[PDB]
Amino acid sequence: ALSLYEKMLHKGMIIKNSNVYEKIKEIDTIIFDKTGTLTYGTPIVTQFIGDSLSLAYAASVEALSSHPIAKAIVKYAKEQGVKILEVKDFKEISGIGVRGKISDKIIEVKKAEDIAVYINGEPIASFNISDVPRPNLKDYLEKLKNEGLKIIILSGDKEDKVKELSKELNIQEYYSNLSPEDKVRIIEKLKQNGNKVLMIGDGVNDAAALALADVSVAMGNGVDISKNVADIILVSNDIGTLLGLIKNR
């Protein structure tokens, strides 16, 4: 008929080396790296404080970045109606901040305090940003009873945010404010403790954790340009189906 390999692609998953087909059979622990899996890979502005002119300055600078956070700020500014302006002496450092010069001012957009806007050293405005939760869940309650799989949520996000998403999906065990190395460190303790771990991630800030898991699943719409290392690629980015595959055991 078709090669196994051709069947799977037809259901929206790319398989590595077929050692995975026998390696799933035995997993008892399913781990979700929250960003891009339980949520879209796409942030949105939820609040802005300051005047319209500060808004424009901040959007003009973020327009030169390719970061998801930047993209979301330029999109929000355009929906309010402001237009993009001339920026000079641009300078970037991914996930920390960005700088540039307009009308002889120096403007800065950074975090570590969500986001703050600065004009000539003065902190004058701010942004508050979050991510959009996906739909489903049933496939969740399913696998909690099915095989009696344990289910864990990991994230680099703040404690109050991971908690709230945990209540809504009804998951007891979660960990917040994790670096990429912390994540590696959690997967280790589970393996030493005799657990068999399946983990699902988007590739950003977690390539090392995924390489460690007994079976790894990567998102397609996540720029896996160079995280092409995972046992399974959910090319469709339909999480239900994998949840469906784990259900057939």
Q: Are strands 150-154 and 29-33 parallel, antiparallel or unpaired?
A: parallel
- Residue 201 assigned to a binding site: no
Q: Regarding beta strands 122-133 and 39-49, do their DSSP bridges make them parallel or antiparallel, or are they unpaired?
A: antiparallel
Q: How far is CA 2 from CA 5, 7, 9, in A?
A: 8, 6, 11
Positions annotated as catalytic residues are: 33
Do 209 and 180 meet the contact criterion of CB atoms below 8 Å apart?
Answer: yes
22 labelled as ligand-binding? no
Contact 80, 55 (CB under 8 A): yes
Q: Is 182 annotated in some ligand binding site?
A: no
d(CA 218, CA 246): 15
Q: Is 205 annotated as a binding residue?
A: yes
What is the enclosing helix (H) or strand (E) of 91?
Answer: strand 88-93
Q: Do 236 and 6 contact (CB within 8 A), yes or no?
A: no
User: What sign results for the dihedral spanned by CA atoms 142, 143, 145, 150?
Assistant: negative
Question: Rounded to 5 degrees, what are φ and ψ at 34?
Answer: -40, -50
Report the run of H or E that residue 144 belongs to, with start and end: helix 138-145
**Is 52 marked as a binding-site residue?**
no
Q: Is 157 annotated as a binding residue?
A: yes
Q: What is the CA radius of gyration of the chain?
A: 21
Neighbours of 145 (CB within 10 A): 8
Q: Are 236 and 228 in contact (CB under 8 A)?
A: no
CA distance 138 to 62: 39
The method of structure determination was X-ray
Resolution reading in Å: 2.6
Q: Which domains does the chain have, with CATH numbers?
A: 1-40+133-249 (3.40.50.1000), 41-132 (3.40.1110.10)
Length of the chain: 249
Backbone angles phi, psi at 214, to 5 degrees: -65, -30
DSSP states along 50-71: S-HHHHHHHHHHHTT---HHHH
Tell me the C-alpha distance between 30 and 171, whole Å.
Answer: 12
Instruction: Please check if 156 is assigned to a binding site.
Output: yes
Residues preceding gaps in the chain (C to N > 2.5 Å): 113
